Amino acid sequence: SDENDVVIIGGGPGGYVAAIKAAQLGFKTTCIEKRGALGGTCLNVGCIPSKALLHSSHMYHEAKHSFANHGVKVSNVEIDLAAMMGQKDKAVSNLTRGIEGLFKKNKVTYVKGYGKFVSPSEISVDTIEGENTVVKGKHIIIATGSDVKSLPGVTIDEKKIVSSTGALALSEIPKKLVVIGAGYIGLEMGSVWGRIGSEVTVVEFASEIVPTMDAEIRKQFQRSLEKQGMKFKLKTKVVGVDTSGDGVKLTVEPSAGGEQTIIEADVVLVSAGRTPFTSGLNLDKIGVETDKLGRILVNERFSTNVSGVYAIGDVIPGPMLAHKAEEDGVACVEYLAGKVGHVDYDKVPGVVYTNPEVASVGKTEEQVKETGVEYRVGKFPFMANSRAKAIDNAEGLVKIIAEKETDKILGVHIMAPNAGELIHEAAIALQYDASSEDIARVCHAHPTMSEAIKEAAMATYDKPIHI
Amino acid sequence: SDENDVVIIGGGPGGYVAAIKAAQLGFKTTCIEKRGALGGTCLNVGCIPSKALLHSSHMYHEAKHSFANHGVKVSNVEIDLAAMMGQKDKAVSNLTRGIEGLFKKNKVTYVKGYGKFVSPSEISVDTIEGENTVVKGKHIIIATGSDVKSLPGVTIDEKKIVSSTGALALSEIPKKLVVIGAGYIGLEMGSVWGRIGSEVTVVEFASEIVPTMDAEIRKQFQRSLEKQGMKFKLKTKVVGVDTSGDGVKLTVEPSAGGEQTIIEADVVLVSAGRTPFTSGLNLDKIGVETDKLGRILVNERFSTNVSGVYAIGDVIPGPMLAHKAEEDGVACVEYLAGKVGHVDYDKVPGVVYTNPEVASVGKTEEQVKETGVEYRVGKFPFMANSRAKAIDNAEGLVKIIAEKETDKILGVHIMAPNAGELIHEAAIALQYDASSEDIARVCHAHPTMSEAIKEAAMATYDKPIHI
Ligand SMILES: Cc1cc2nc3c(=O)[nH]c(=O)nc-3n(C[C@H](O)[C@H](O)[C@H](O)COP(=O)(O)OP(=O)(O)OC[C@H]3O[C@@H](n4cnc5c(N)ncnc54)[C@H](O)[C@@H]3O)c2cc1C
Ligand SMILES: Cc1cc2nc3c(=O)[nH]c(=O)nc-3n(C[C@H](O)[C@H](O)[C@H](O)COP(=O)(O)OP(=O)(O)OC[C@H]3O[C@@H](n4cnc5c(N)ncnc54)[C@H](O)[C@@H]3O)c2cc1C
C-alpha cells in the first residue's frame, strides 16, 4: 500500500523545500497551498518581486547619474513604469513554474486548497471550487506563513495606504511617499520608488532605523540613505490617518509629548512588522500551543505539543527570513528521516538590499560588548580597494569582530553594493569557528571587492597592507 | 641614511608589498623603480586600466541592450571615448598616489631610477638625462617584472599594431580589429572594444582558447564570447604582415596545412604571451640563474643561485598574476624576518574579467582526470538561481570537483558575471581542504548569487534542492 508519509500545509520556503527534501528522503509527500501559485511570500510578494524592482530602479538611477563619468552619454532617460512591473511579474511567475516543475521531478503531490486540521493526522482542504479533499499522513508539517502586521489607527485599503504587496504594485510613481515602518522592507520600498522619482520620508516610533543592525554600520548606513535623498521622523507615533482628499493626511504626534503635527503624503507605506499566520488553520480541534504573539511553540526536533504535528518557518520563533525558513524545513525532515537535523539562528545572515547593501553575520559589536569578553575590531573601506576605485563605486566597508585572546571571529558586517555576495566568505568562516588570520591566510583574486574582507581581517589580529 | 636593511628593485605588486610588509616587519627598506609612477604593471597598463575599460564598455553595452527590458528608456546612446579613457586614467593615477602615500606611512624610501647590480650588495640606479642615485643593502629582492613577447609578425610600435598597452589607449574605436593571442588579456581587449563598436576576431595558434581553463567551462565560455560578436580563428598563424599605409594585411597560415589567406584590419592586437623582464638590472655580472624561458630560478626561501639576493613576482617560475606576485613578496620578507613564509601556486585563483567572468580555483576536471582518482562533479546553473532570474542576468554556472571517497574539493570553476567575487567562497574552503558537504552546511543568504555555490555543492556529494 502506498500509504502517504508526510503532509505539509504551506507552499513557501519552509514548505516546498521541506516537501522536496522529504521526497528526496523517500517519503510520499503532499504540500498543500491556498495561494494561486506555489512561490511562498518570497516568490510572489517579497524577495524576488522586491529584488527585481530594486535592481530596475537602480538601473534607472545609475543611468541618470553615473553613465556620464564613464563615456556612456545618453540623451534622455525615462521610466516606462508599465514595463518594470513587467519583468518583475515575468520573473516571479517564471520562478514559480520552475518550482511546480520541481515538485513534479521529486514526486511531491501538489494539492491546491486551504487546509484545516481535522485531526492530529488528517487534513480537510477547503476550496478548489467549493469542495473538500481529504489529505492524511503519519507526520504533518505546519508551514503556514506570516502576514502583515496591522497598525492600530491605520486601516489599510489597497489604495493610498498600502502594505508590502501594494507598494510593490503601485500603478503611479507617487510624488510624495511616506513609509511608516522603518525596517528592511520599509527602507527597501523607500529606495525603490524614491530612485524612480518619489520624494520619500520614513516615520519610525523607535529610537533608530533597523534596530538589529550594528550601530557603527547603521550610523553610516542611514547617513547614506540620506546623502541620497530620504528623511526620517524618528521616535514618532501616529494618532489618526486622514484620507478625504488628494493624498493622505497624517496626524503624527510623538510617542509621549502628545503634541500632534501633520504630514502630507500621496501614498503611505505601512511597514510595521509581520506576524505568524495560523488563521483559519483548523488550529483548535487538536490545539497546538502557541505563545503570546502567535508563533507556534516547538522543540529541538521541531515538534508541537501534538505528537505527529510539526511547525517550521515564519510560524515558529526565530528570525523571519526565507533561508531561516528553508533551514527549518530540512532540519525537520532530516530528523523525521532519522538523521540528525541542524539549525542555528545565530549564523542565519541578514541582508538589506538597499543601494549599499548591508550584509551581517555573527554578532554585532553591541552584543559582543554585552558578553564582557575582550575583543578587537578590524575595518577596511572600499575607498582603498583597487577594484572599487577602478570602477568608481567605492562606498562601503568591511568590519570584522574577533575575540582578543583567541582571534575567533564574532561577527562580520559589511555595508556595500553586492555586500550580500561578499558576506558569504565571512559566513562560511564563521560556521567553522574560524579566526581573522585564517581568512586573511587565504589568497584572494586581485582585483576584487573580496580583497576588502581580506584586508579587514588582517586589520583585526595584525595590521593591514593598504591602510 | 636610513636605508640598508632591505633593497627591492621593482615597484610592482611584488615590490611595493614586499616593500611595505618589510617596513612593517622592522627593516629599513628601499624600493627602486624606473617607471614614472609606483603602480606595478597591475596598475599603469594592466589589471586596473583593463578592469576600468571593461566596466565602462560594459555599461555602454548594457544601456544599448538591457535597459529596455527594465523599463528604462534612453533616446540616443553614444560613446564619449575621450571621457572613458579619462575615468580610466583618473582612477589609475588616483591609485598610484595612494601607493606612494603608503610608502610614506610605513617609511619605505622611494628611489626613482633604474637599478643595476654592482655587486651582490650594490646596484647602480641612474636615469635618462639624469644622475645616478646610490643604494646598497644586505638582502636584495629582485622584483623587476615581465613584458610583452615577440613573434614572426611583430611591430612593437605605438598605434599601427598594438600590445597590451597600445590597446588600452587607442584614440579611435577601430572598425575591424583582430587580436592575435587568444587568452586572458586578449579576450579582454577584444571584449572591451567589441562592445564599444569594433568588429573583432581573435586568431590563436592553439587548438582552443585559454588552455588552462577547465574544458567544460571553456566550451560554454567560448560559445558565450561568440554571441557577443567575436569570431575566433584557430589552428592558424600570420607569416606575412603589412604596415603599408592604411592598416595591416595579415596573411593567415595554419599549423602546416599551409596556404595563403588574408585578414584585412584597422588595427591588430598582439596578445602573445608575456616574458619575465630581467634586462636593466645586471645579472650578466653576478652569475645568477636565468635558465628557463627567461625566468630567474629560485628556492624555498626565494633565494637565487646567489647569497644576499632574492627574486619574486613575474620574474620567477609560477603563474603571472598580481596576487601570485603579491604572495611571493610577502612570503619572502616574512622568511627574512625569521618567521615562516608560505606560498601555494596551486591555490592561486584565476579570473578572466570578460562579460561572463570565469573564475576557477583548485584543479580542472582534466587535471583531476590525469590523477586517476575517483571523483564526483557538482553543477548548478544560474538559470535556476532566484536572485539571478529576478534580475534577468543569469548566464553561467557553478561547478565543483570532489574526491569520490572523501568528498574533499579539488577545484571550483565559475562562469558568471561577478564570478570573481563568488569564487572566494570556494577559494577559502579549498584552502582548508574542506568538503562539498562543508560548504553546503553553510547557511546562505537568500536571494543571492551565492546560493548557486551552495547548490553546486550539495549536487556533489548528495542531491540539490532546486535542480
Ligand atoms: C516585502 C517582503 C520582502 C522580503 N524580503 C526578504 C528578503 O529579501 N530575504 C529573506 O530572506 N526574506 C524576505 N522576506 C521574508 C520571506 O519571504 C519569509 O521569511 C519566508 O517566505 C517565510 O517562509 P515560509 O516558509 O514561512 O513561507 P510563507 O511564504 O510565509 O508562507 C507559506 C504559504 O503558506 C500559505 N498558507 C498559509 N496558511 C495556509 C492554509 N491553511 N492552507 C494552505 N496554504 C496556506 C500562504 O499562501 C503562504 O504563501 C520578505 C517578506 C516580505 C513580505
Ligand atoms: C594587460 C594586462 C592585464 C593584466 N590583468 C591582470 C589581472 O586582471 N589580474 C592579475 O592578477 N594580473 C593581471 N596582469 C598581470 C599582473 O599585472 C602581474 O602579474 C603583476 O603586476 C606582476 O607583479 P610584479 O610584482 O612582478 O610587478 P611588475 O609590475 O611586473 O614589475 C615591477 C616594475 O619593475 C620595473 N622595473 C623593471 N626593471 C627595473 C630596474 N632595473 N630598475 C627599476 N625598476 C625596474 C618596471 O618598470 C615594472 O613596472 C595583467 C597584465 C597585463 C599586461
Side-chain angles (χ1 to χ4, degrees), chain B residues 47-339:
Chain B
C47 302
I48 306 295
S50 181
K51 258 36 59 185
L53 279 208
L54 291 160
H55 190 282
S56 297
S57 49
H58 184 233
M59 298 183 110
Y60 170 69
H61 186 79
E62 287 294 302
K64 188 202 164 193
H65 287 64
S66 297
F67 276 17
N69 209 342
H70 288 259
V72 168
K73 283 301 172 180
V74 278
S75 306
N76 294 298
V77 191
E78 331 173 77
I79 321 63
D80 187 330
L81 175 72
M84 216 165 68
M85 293 312 307
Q87 168 264 178
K88 157 207 163 193
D89 296 320
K90 169 201 181 185
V92 167
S93 55
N94 191 145
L95 287 158
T96 72
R97 290 189 280 273
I99 282 179
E100 191 152 348
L102 274 180
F103 278 7
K104 287 178 192 171
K105 200 175 200 275
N106 302 309
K107 298 177 177 174
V108 185
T109 299
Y110 182 10
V111 166
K112 305 190 182 182
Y114 198 143
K116 182 198 196 187
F117 275 99
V118 174
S119 97
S121 186
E122 311 177 299
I123 72 92
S124 190
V125 181
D126 41 273
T127 4
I128 313 178
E129 192 192 62
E131 300 109 56
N132 201 82
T133 319
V134 199
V135 293
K136 150 190 182 180
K138 300 180 180 180
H139 312 100
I140 284 186
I141 307 174
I142 290 178
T144 64
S146 65
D147 186 38
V148 186
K149 175 162 150 185
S150 182
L151 218 78
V154 181
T155 308
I156 312 304
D157 72 4
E158 190 172 49
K159 290 321 165 179
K160 181 73 175 185
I161 301 179
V162 300
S163 53
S164 309
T165 328
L168 300 174
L170 311 163
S171 58
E172 188 191 315
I173 301 174
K175 279 302 161 191
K176 228 173 189 186
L177 165 68
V178 175
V179 182
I180 266 164
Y184 217 73
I185 300 177
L187 296 185
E188 290 202 344
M189 309 310 343
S191 233
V192 161
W193 300 98
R195 299 170 179 175
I196 265 319
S198 305
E199 191 180 57
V200 330
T201 86
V202 237
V203 175
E204 185 54 297
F205 181 106
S207 47
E208 295 294 324
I209 62 179
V210 199
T212 89
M213 199 178 145
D214 169 284
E216 215 182 318
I217 304 298
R218 173 172 49 56
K219 286 192 185 68
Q220 282 182 52
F221 173 57
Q222 186 182 312
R223 199 159 287 154
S224 189
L225 292 181
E226 206 184 298
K227 289 170 182 176
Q228 313 171 26
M230 307 199 240
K231 171 158 193 157
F232 296 75
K233 239 141 182 81
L234 327 151
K235 242 192 179 192
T236 72
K237 190 175 183 179
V238 194
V239 168
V241 198
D242 179 88
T243 335
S244 180
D246 59 355
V248 193
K249 249 185 179 284
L250 302 166
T251 316
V252 282
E253 289 177 48
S255 36
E259 225 210 287
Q260 293 253 335
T261 17
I262 350 69
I263 294 328
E264 301 178 298
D266 263 73
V267 157
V268 192
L269 169 54
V270 166
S271 175
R274 270 188 93 72
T275 56
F277 193 69
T278 53
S279 303
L281 54 147
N282 237 309
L283 302 93
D284 217 288
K285 286 299 185 196
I286 331 166
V288 169
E289 280 287 295
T290 304
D291 286 297
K292 266 308 164 261
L293 291 87
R295 296 173 250 175
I296 290 179
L297 306 293
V298 82
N299 84 357
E300 295 190 57
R301 286 205 164 195
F302 281 104
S303 179
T304 7
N305 63 322
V306 159
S307 178
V309 190
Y310 304 101
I312 68 167
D314 283 357
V315 238
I316 88 185
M320 296 192 247
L321 302 178
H323 45 301
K324 185 272 197 167
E326 287 190 37
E327 207 188 48
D328 310 327
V330 179
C332 183
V333 166
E334 294 187 302
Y335 268 164
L336 299 179
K339 294 195 173 181

Side-chain angles (χ1 to χ4, degrees), chain A residues 223-249:
Chain A
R223 193 152 302 165
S224 196
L225 275 189
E226 308 195 343
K227 69 192 202 317
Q228 208 287 65
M230 195 166 244
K231 315 177 204 311
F232 313 84
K233 303 194 83 180
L234 303 169
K235 302 176 182 178
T236 334
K237 182 192 70 178
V238 316
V239 180
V241 183
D242 299 301
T243 47
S244 166
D246 316 35
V248 191
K249 239 188 296 165

Side-chain angles (χ1 to χ4, degrees), chain A residues 441-458:
Chain A
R441 210 169 194 60
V442 183
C443 167
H444 301 49
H446 170 303
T448 81
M449 305 291 291
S450 293
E451 291 191 283
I453 313 192
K454 177 175 177 67
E455 292 281 324
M458 300 176 152

Side-chain angles (χ1 to χ4, degrees), chain A residues 78 390 418 421 432 438 445 450, chain B residues 418 421 424 432 438 449-450:
Chain A
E78 294 175 64
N418 284 36
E421 296 317 308
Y432 298 116
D438 296 317
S450 293
Chain B
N418 280 36
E421 303 299 320
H424 287 76
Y432 302 112
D438 286 323
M449 309 280 287
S450 285

